[PDB]
Design a protein around this ligand. Structure first.
Ligand SMILES: Nc1ncnc2c1ncn2[C@@H]1O[C@H](COP(=O)(O)OP(=O)(O)NP(=O)(O)O)[C@@H](O)[C@H]1O
Length: 303
């Protein structure tokens, strides 16, 4: 039976926060960098503010609220933090600012400076995030490098709950999908594991596109034929065999997230044994003056 969901949904006054910069437009909506000053509190919290495309079509109001619902109900160091909503005219989603942006852009932009320690720690942290969702019985359904955010090079969090569901519920990123999901729209914790596999492959190839070329329509055929993504240059057979296990047809044959935490964690203790990166040993990885009161969202706790 389902426990009552007692998450608090915080409604925020438009006056409590100043926008500052656009971060990402075009696609569907507009995300700004900003600072949130709660009521009378004397803290300023860096935040991202997702005020969706001006037009207020009741269709997409229903979709930003579902995210808010999910994000308000999660609480884990490796899942993105929702501060609250603003009901202005178009619904504003207010999350913790993740200054380094999405992990896909971050690996793409920084290939030459990314060591094995970072790559494997990311793997461990993503698997922790996903394991936590598994404990809350959430199937994410859209895990990808584009949907993991970077608070710092050493701390990432899963984002984009716009397709999350409870395991069992009944209510398209084809290249990240478990075969049962493309064929039967079955979606399980184990189909999230498939997508973890792809996300890891995106990281290990420093942001390549999976099945670059092959059009979406061909994908399910390819997999039934038994083809998978190729071994990235930097990966030992050890790392790659974990990817491949995530991509087994038998869903229950795939690893569990808790096993993934364990395995990458072992590897993270000796990173150079597991990823082979040219120049590994030597790699290493805001605004205004009134910054006395700045507090990261992670240090701003609410009773
Ligand atoms: N909390 C955040 N902190 C910093 N940057 C963010 C944050 N949320 C989003 N962004 C940036 O804005 C981009 C677009 O945001 P997002 O709304 O996730 O993309 P989208 O294509 O509109 N939908 P989706 O990727 O499915 O969530 C992200 O990839 C980031 O570069």
């Amino acid at each position: 039976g389902e426990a009552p969901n007692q998450a608090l949904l915080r409604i925020l006054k438009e006056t409590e926060f100043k926008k500052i910069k656009v971060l990402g437009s075009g696609a569907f909506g507009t995300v700004y960098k900003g600072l949130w000053i709660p009521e009378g509190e004397k803290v300023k919290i860096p935040v991202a503010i997702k005020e969706l495309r001006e037009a207020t079509s009741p269709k997409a109001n229903k979709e930003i609220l579902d995210e808010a619902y999910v994000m308000a109900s999660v609480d884990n160091p490796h899942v993105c933090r929702l501060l609250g909503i603003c009901l202005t005219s178009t619904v504003q989603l207010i999350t913790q600012l993740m200054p380094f942006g999405c992990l896909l852009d971050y690996v793409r932009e920084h290939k030459d400076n990314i060591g094995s320690q970072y790559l494997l720690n990311w793997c461990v942290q993503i698997a922790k995030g996903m394991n936590y969702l598994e404990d809350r019985r959430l199937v994410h359904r859209d895990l990808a490098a584009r949907n993991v955010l970077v608070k710092t090079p050493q701390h990432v969090k899963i984002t984009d709950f716009g397709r999350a569901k409870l395991l069992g519920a009944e209510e398209v990123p084809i290249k990240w999908m478990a075969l049962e999901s493309i064929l039967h729209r079955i979606y399980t914790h184990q189909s999230d594991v498939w997508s973890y596999g792809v996300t890891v492959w995106e990281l290990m190839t420093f942001g390549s596109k999976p099945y670059d070329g092959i059009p979406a329509s061909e994908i399910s055929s390819i997999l039934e034929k038994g083809e998978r993504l190729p071994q990235p240059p930097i990966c030992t057979i050890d790392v790659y065999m974990i990817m491949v296990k995530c991509w087994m047809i038998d869903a229950d044959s795939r690893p569990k997230f808790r096993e993934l935490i364990i395995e990458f964690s072992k590897m993270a203790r000796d990173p150079q044994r597991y990823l082979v990166i040219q120049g590994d040993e030597r790699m290493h990885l805001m605004d205004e003056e009134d910054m006395d009161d700045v507090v990261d969202a992670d240090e701003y706790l609410i009773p």
